[PDB]
């Protein structure tokens, strides 16, 4: 019953923790509490390893105990918050943090923890406030500094940018070396000027976070199959994603599980998230050989068993370090071969991940040392898009001549052709080829609809729809879950674009822009007098800042135009209004890349070192447009300017993209799938041969 005894034991446990040996720390803490139950600090310390071990349930009970004993223990409130957060109970965690700040106004971690909730709710100006307060109180606070840095990144606050960057690197350098988990999140690492070893090292550490969370299950390694006999000659592939729903990942690959060859492959899909109700989820469930809802199985042990139960040869991780991920599954190693694919644009840095699926343009062999996995190359690009299936109404277009431009007033629709046939005076420009309606009563009716901002009209019996009102006319078609059953008008005046301008667009989230990237565009815009840059309020708080920096680089306000975020279908379709897309080189347009290319809009890129800064190039290569790929800032500007001045050249390239998007393999999910199948079987043969994974660069 001795406090002193217990006190010493605590001192010992804290030692055992420092020497990284978690196992033992817990055993000691537990004995310290056995001797003296009313020990606050023991309770607090035992809690946080239980938290580390992912035993939250319990870790919570102990934090609750700690408080009851020491009501002024501000440090325990804060942590209990973190726990409650990690238990999807945001409400109660929020209560802890505020309660902690109220008790100790000066306690800095609370202020940061609070900011972090705000960050996850996507209210950023508040998150920033609270980070600034936290840093004021404790001017040396990595977690807070780094998280702040990321917010400022998202709103395009670029104050002290260069010192901020150097400072980040600086902090990460320290933390990597002091063997402490780094404040920069691997998903963001690509945004800063770190070394590639540094980036791999970060990933590596978050790799080890799962490793500890599963060690405490004490599970025997699994016996993997060694041949295809039990599965009847079929290779059993398992996709594991938290985004079989309305989400980019689905927007890309929803067709693929459907497209596998049933003779040679058996497809298992493992959803990490509950059914959201959308058609994406439905298709995948309808088309995969087996669909397993792992969100019903929170325990990682039983989940992994369930995978191994199913006899999976290749397990595909589509999440990496993104929201809703559960890599503890992969860490448990239920399939002999485990590959990263499509979903996460970076190395896992982890031992339990065998292959990363990519290509030579995105991950050339020089830079194989960036990844911890062996490379598996697809023959063209590893990227892919459902656009062909999702948006068939964009295969063809027709235009109105209102005075021959291809992107001023556009018309798309499944039944466009029959409607043009109803019309008396259509003219047929050659490139397929592009129908042009002349300025008649018809044309005038359409344009007046647009002008008065009316939902829809009827011409010769066909429905003509304002392409700003689609969510009203048909919710499902606007989200991309249905194909639109009318004809849709899209025009520059709808978005306040100047009818006779050169429109450079970039539709990405604004965090992808940095002061360099902006400078380049500034230059381009100066050299092309009839130009405007088209951006998105993503988020809206971002807009003033760009406007600001744009103005200091010497651009009048009216030179940059902001549009609001739109539903998928409208978003893709209005890409047709743009003349050239200008790609962010810090981090490329990924899904967006596909989106803008589908509209027939050429995109200028400047590939860098990081995978994520190379994807766009890789897409353009596959398409067959190397003249759009710049070797440096300088060349980037020139390619843009050439497009923006040389209207003949512009037309040549635009026509190329338009044609190529069909005829190249890029938007070809069937061909894509078959290649993915090749690469699968290669991986298998090799492992069945008795070999540990090596590069599959062919």
């Amino acid at each position: 019953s001795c406090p002193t005894h217990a006190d010493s034991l605590n001192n010992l446990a804290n030692i055992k923790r420092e020497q990284g040996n978690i196992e033992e720390a817990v055993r000691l803490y537990r004995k310290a509490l056995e001797v003296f139950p009313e020990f606050a600090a023991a309770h607090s310390n035992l809690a946080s390893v239980l938290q580390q071990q992912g035993k939250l349930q319990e870790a919570l009970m102990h934090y609750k105990e700690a408080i009851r004993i020491s009501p002024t223990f501000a440090d325990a409130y804060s942590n209990m918050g973190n726990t409650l957060k990690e238990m999807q109970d945001v409400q109660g965690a929020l209560q802890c943090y505020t309660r902690a700040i109220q008790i100790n106004p000066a306690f800095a971690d609370a202020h940061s923890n609070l900011a972090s909730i705000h960050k996850d709710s996507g209210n950023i100006p508040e998150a920033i406030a609270s980070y600034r307060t936290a840093l004021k109180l404790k001017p040396d606070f990595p977690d807070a500094y780094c998280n702040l840095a990321h917010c400022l990144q998202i709103v395009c606050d670029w104050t002290d940018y260069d010192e901020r960057m150097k400072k980040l690197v600086s902090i990460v350098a320290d933390q990597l070396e002091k063997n402490r988990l780094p404040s920069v999140h691997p998903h963001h690492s690509m945004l800063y000027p770190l070394s590639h070893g540094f980036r791999k090292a970060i990933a590596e550490r978050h790799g080890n976070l799962c490793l500890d969370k599963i060690n405490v299950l004490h599970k025997p390694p699994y016996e993997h199959p060694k041949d295809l006999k039990l599965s009847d000659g079929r290779l059993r592939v398992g996709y594991v994603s938290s985004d079989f729903g309305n989400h980019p990942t689905s927007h890309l690959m929803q067709s693929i599980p459907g497209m596998h060859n049933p003779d040679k492959f058996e497809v298992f899909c493992y959803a990490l998230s509950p059914d959201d109700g959308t058609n994406f989820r439905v298709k995948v469930m309808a088309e995969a050989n087996h669909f397993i809802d792992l969100s019903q199985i929170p325990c990682n042990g039983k989940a992994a068993d369930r995978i191994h139960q199913d006899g999976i040869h290749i397990l595909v991780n589509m999440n990496g370090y993104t929201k809703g991920a559960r890599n503890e599954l992969f860490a448990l190693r239920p399939a002999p071969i485990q590959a990263m694919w499509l979903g996460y644009p970076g190395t896992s840095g982890a031992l339990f991940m065998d292959y990363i699926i990519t290509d030579q343009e995105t991950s050339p062999a020089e830079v194989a040392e960036q990844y911890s996995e062996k490379l598996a190359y697809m023959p063209h690009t590893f990227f892919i898009g459902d656009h062909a299936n999702m948006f068939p109404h964009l295969k063809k277009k027709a235009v109105i001549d209102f005075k021959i431009y291809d992107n001023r007033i556009v018309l798309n629709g499944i039944d466009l052709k029959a409607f043009l046939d109803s019309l008396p005076d259509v003219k047929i420009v050659k490139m397929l080829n592009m129908p042009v309606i002349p300025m008649n009563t018809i044309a005038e009716a359409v344009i007046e609809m647009i002008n008065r901002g009316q939902i829809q009209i009827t011409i010769n019996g066909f429905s003509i729809s304002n392409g700003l009102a689609t969510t009203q006319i048909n919710n499902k078609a606007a989200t991309g879950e249905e194909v639109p059953r009318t004809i849709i008008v899209t025009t520059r005046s709808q978005y306040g674009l100047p009818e006779d301008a050169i429109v450079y667009c970039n539709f990405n989230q604004l965090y992808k822009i940095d002061p360099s990237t902006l400078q380049m565009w500034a230059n381009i815009l100066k050299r092309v007098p009839n130009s405007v840059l088209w951006l998105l309020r993503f988020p809206a708080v971002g807009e003033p800042n760009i406007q600001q920096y744009a103005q200091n680089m010497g651009l009048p306000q009216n030179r940059i135009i902001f549009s609001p975020v739109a539903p998928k279908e409208e978003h893709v379709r209005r890409g047709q209004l743009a003349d050239v897309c200008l790609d962010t080189p810090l981090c490329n347009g990924h899904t967006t890349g596909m989106d803008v290319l589908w509209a027939g809009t050429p995109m200028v890129t400047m590939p860098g070192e990081t995978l994520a800064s190379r994807v766009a190039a890789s897409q353009l290569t596959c398409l067959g447009c190397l003249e759009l790929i710049a070797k440096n800032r300088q060349e980037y500007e020139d390619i843009a300017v050439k497009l923006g001045t040389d209207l003949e050249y512009l037309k040549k390239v635009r026509g190329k993209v338009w044609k190529q998007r069909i005829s190249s393999p890029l938007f070809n999910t069937k061909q894509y799938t078959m290649e993915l199948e090749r690469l699968y079987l290669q991986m298998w043969e090799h492992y069945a041969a008795g070999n540990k994974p090596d590069h599959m660069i062919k």
Binding site: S116, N246, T249, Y321, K323, A325, V565, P567, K568, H571
Partner: peptide, 11 residues
């Protein structure tokens, strides 16, 4: 308005 799903970190 309308917000759309996008990828983001693990928090």
């Amino acid at each position: 308005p309308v917000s759309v799903p996008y990828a983001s970190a693990q928090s």
